[PDB]
């Protein structure tokens, strides 16, 4: 009875404006709202649907106990259906629950280890819910988690090579635990990808971020953001000024063997740094990095080959394979075959003395491919600026800044 | 780096190294350029997350 | 103010000195003289109207070769490096203020930076329309 | 070249699925691609994500996997002998071909860059056969050769918008 009277006053409230109070009805719940509404849910909203939609959803996903019968895979599909004809700008107006109901819908399908059904569900979501694209919304540490779970790195990449530059209030929730995991899966998902010159930079936010009490996320992106600077850099990069002072002062002590790990690999002896994997083995198979570390011990053999390069013009091979400690001169080659492979020297080998020549000339900058590239560094630093300006010109006019 | 010079073993000669001057600024210039866009994003990125009380709480 | 015509003449620029004095009592290198306290230095500037400009520049127009033949910052090397020394100096004293002067800093570099960019553009045009006639 | 446009209609035909698992042809097309391109991680990463039972269900997988663990290892010549070891089906018949001249011109240019002078038994493994393709290499290309040794010598092969756009940002 107040079902019926319910609905056909969201149906007369909506396409006439009259938003604020609509709203004030989509969060008035009504205990449990009559739970059987399921069926006439279908002639509530049609073509372009409506919000009582939503708020159905979410009540129905509100439940968190067994929630929409063993059918629920049915009620999945209706959320796609959803995703794919919400449209419109109203749904902005309730950037509180969509995120709640894509939250209850990823944990469903983790909870029953099928994360991949869901990964398109989530990119729509977000497209529709972000003022521009530009913008972080809870959702994108949801996705980064669902890609993340099941190995599929690609699809989440269009989201990454963004430089987010605002974040949505969602008009209250969104903790740091949602910036925190975001920024922490993002950089797991680059190093995946041998891209470690951005999961390092994202390791690094995730790091300074302000805190007061130790969190759980923050120490296995502080663990792994030494091994990815010692896999790119030679050192432990040193971490800015203006980082939050619980990791200078809880979180360094909780987690020494990777500082120790660090000073074995600040001093080139490959077999101190096998001795200390061995021993601290129990320690990174816990945090489950494991293979990140095997990184670092081989790139040690890199870098070494390269610190060669700036004293050597013309070395032996078997000369080259008593420094390095490669314990061969075939293995030698192969090494710096490989390593000639992927541009990160530049090497020749002769076979008929078993010599490698360091040549060392990259580019003389008169090539127009470099002008090419000044431009692009041109064009990246002027958008820069202009969005520096549209931000300053917001703050110009800010009612705030005019009385003092 | 008391010495710029390279060591031929194949001849046994060390040879004297003379560095380009014009491809070092470059190299140099485009580094801090690097490094300047990454600060300043990195930044930007902070203002925003200061901005709507972010503490870890 | 203070000319030297042998200078100006031998040169080919102008030796126009502005000076005004600090008077007696205040007392808060030798190519100004042994005075140098007693008198300071001051910065020049220059204006023409509308009419002069139109008839300067319509005067000036009869140097076309010279125009499109002087090909700017292969003489004016000197005075960009010394303009970008002095860039150095005002960074730095700019940067320790900070820790205003960075505005000034910020518009020479722009000035230099036009110029230079003149220069350049005017090179690209003189060999889009000289060197590509007739393959 | 025609091969990109295949890519990406695999792609958003993997993205999304009845139930999340697709046919086998489909998934052993997009892992074979994913190997010719070069990008061993996301072939890598998509090995992991079958399923064992499907994985176990058809042993083309299991034959893609292993040239693409030996193309992982950068072992040149035991990838000949792994490509065509078993029997490929026609939905993945033209991948095999490409996948070989790629390495080939690969290897050439391996070869070619990090190399002055390497024994001509290498280089004709690196190659594909020790046969014809030393006396192509010298005679076609010039690369110089020496007997006895058998030594090859192998050697390395709109305008002012932008300024007055630059101008005007500076001026402003």
Redesign the interface.
């Given at each position: 009875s107040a079902l019926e009277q319910f609905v056909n006053s969201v149906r007369q409230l909506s396409a006439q404006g009259q938003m604020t109070q609509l709203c004030e009805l989509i969060n008035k719940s009504g205990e449990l709202l009559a739970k059987n509404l399921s069926h006439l849910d279908t002639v509530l909203g049609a073509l372009d649907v409506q919000e009582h939609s939503l708020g159905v959803l979410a009540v129905l996903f509100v439940k968190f106990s067994m929630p929409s019968v063993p059918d629920f895979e049915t009620l999945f599909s209706q959320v796609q259906l959803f995703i794919s004809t919400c449209n419109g700008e109203h749904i902005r107006y309730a950037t509180d629950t969509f995120a709640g109901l894509c939250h209850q819908l990823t944990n469903a399908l983790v909870e029953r280890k099928q994360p991949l059904r869901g990964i398109g569900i989530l990119k729509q979501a977000i497209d529709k819910m972000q003022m521009n694209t530009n913008q972080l919304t809870s959702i994108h540490a949801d996705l980064c988690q669902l890609c993340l779970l099941a190995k599929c790195f690609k699809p989440a990449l269009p989201y990454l090579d963004v430089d987010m530059m605002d974040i949505c209030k969602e008009n209250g929730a969104y903790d740091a635990k949602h910036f925190l995991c975001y920024y922490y899966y993002g950089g797991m998902i680059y190093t995946g990808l041998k891209n470690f010159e951005r999961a390092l930079y994202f390791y690094e936010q995730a790091i300074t971020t302000p805190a007061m009490a130790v969190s759980h996320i923050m120490l296995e992106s502080y663990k792994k953001y030494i091994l990815v600077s010692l896999i790119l850099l030679g050192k432990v990069q040193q971490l800015p000024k203006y980082t939050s002072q619980i990791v200078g002062r809880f979180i360094k002590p909780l987690s020494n063997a990777y500082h120790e790990l660090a000073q074995v690999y600040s001093t080139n002896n490959p077999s101190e740094l096998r001795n200390l994997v061995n021993k601290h083995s129990e320690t990174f198979t816990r945090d489950n990095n494991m293979g990140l570390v095997k990184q670092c011990l081989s790139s040690l053999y890199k870098k070494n080959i390269q610190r060669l390069t700036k004293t050597f013009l013309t070395l032996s091979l078997q000369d080259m394979a008593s420094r390095v400690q490669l314990s061969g001169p075939q293995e030698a080659e192969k090494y710096v075959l490989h390593m000639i492979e992927d541009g990160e020297i530049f090497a020749s080998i002769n076979q008929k003395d078993g010599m490698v020549s360091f040549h060392d000339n990259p580019e003389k900058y008169n090539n127009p491919a470099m002008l090419h590239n000044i431009d692009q560094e041109m064009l990246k630093c002027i958008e820069l600026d202009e969005r520096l300006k549209a931000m300053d010109q917001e703050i110009t006019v800010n009612p705030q800044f005019v009385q003092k | 780096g008391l010495i710029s010079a390279r060591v031929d073993s194949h001849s046994k000669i060390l040879y004297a190294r003379d560095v380009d001057q014009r491809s070092t600024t470059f190299e140099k210039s485009l580094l801090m350029g690097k490094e300047f866009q990454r600060r300043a994003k990195a930044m930007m990125l902070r203002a925003a997350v200061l901005r709507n009380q972010i503490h870890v709480k | 103010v203070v000319i030297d015509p042998t200078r100006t003449i031998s040169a080919g620029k102008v030796n126009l000195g502005a000076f005004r004095t600090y008077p007696k009592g205040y007392k808060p290198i030798e190519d100004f003289g042994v005075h140098c306290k007693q008198y300071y230095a001051l910065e020049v500037s220059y204006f023409k109207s509308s009419l002069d400009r139109k008839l300067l520049e319509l005067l000036w127009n009869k140097y076309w070769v010279n125009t499109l033949s002087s090909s700017s910052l292969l003489t004016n090397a000197d005075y960009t490096t010394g303009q970008v020394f002095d860039l150095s100096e005002k960074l730095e004293q700019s940067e320790a203020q900070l820790g205003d002067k960075l505005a000034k800093a910020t518009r020479d570099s722009?000035k230099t930076?036009?110029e230079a960019?003149?220069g350049?553009?005017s090179q690209?045009?003189k060999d889009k329309l000289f060197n590509q006639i007739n393959i | 070249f025609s091969f990109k446009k295949l890519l990406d209609q695999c792609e958003n035909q993997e993205l999304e699925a009845p139930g999340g698992i697709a046919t086998p042809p489909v998934y052993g097309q997009l892992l074979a691609l994913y190997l010719l391109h070069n990008d061993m991680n996301n072939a890598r990463y998509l090995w992991k994500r079958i399923p064992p039972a499907i994985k176990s269900a058809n042993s083309e997988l299991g034959g893609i996997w292993s040239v693409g663990q030996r193309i992982w290892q950068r072992d040149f010549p035991g990838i000949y002998t792994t490509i065509n070891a078993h029997q490929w089906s026609e939905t993945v018949q033209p991948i095999m071909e490409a996948l070989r001249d790629a390495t080939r011109r690969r290897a050439f240019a391996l070869v070619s860059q990090a190399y002055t002078s390497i024994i001509a038994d290498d280089f004709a493994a690196f190659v594909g056969l020790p046969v014809e393709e030393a006396v192509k290499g010298i005679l076609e290309q010039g690369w110089q050769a020496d007997s006895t040794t058998r030594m090859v010598l192998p050697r390395k092969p709109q305008?002012?918008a932008r300024?007055?756009d630059?101008?005007a940002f500076?001026?402003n």
């Open positions: - | - | 722009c930076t036009i960019i003149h350049l553009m690209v045009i | 305008q002012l300024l007055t630059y101008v500076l001026e």
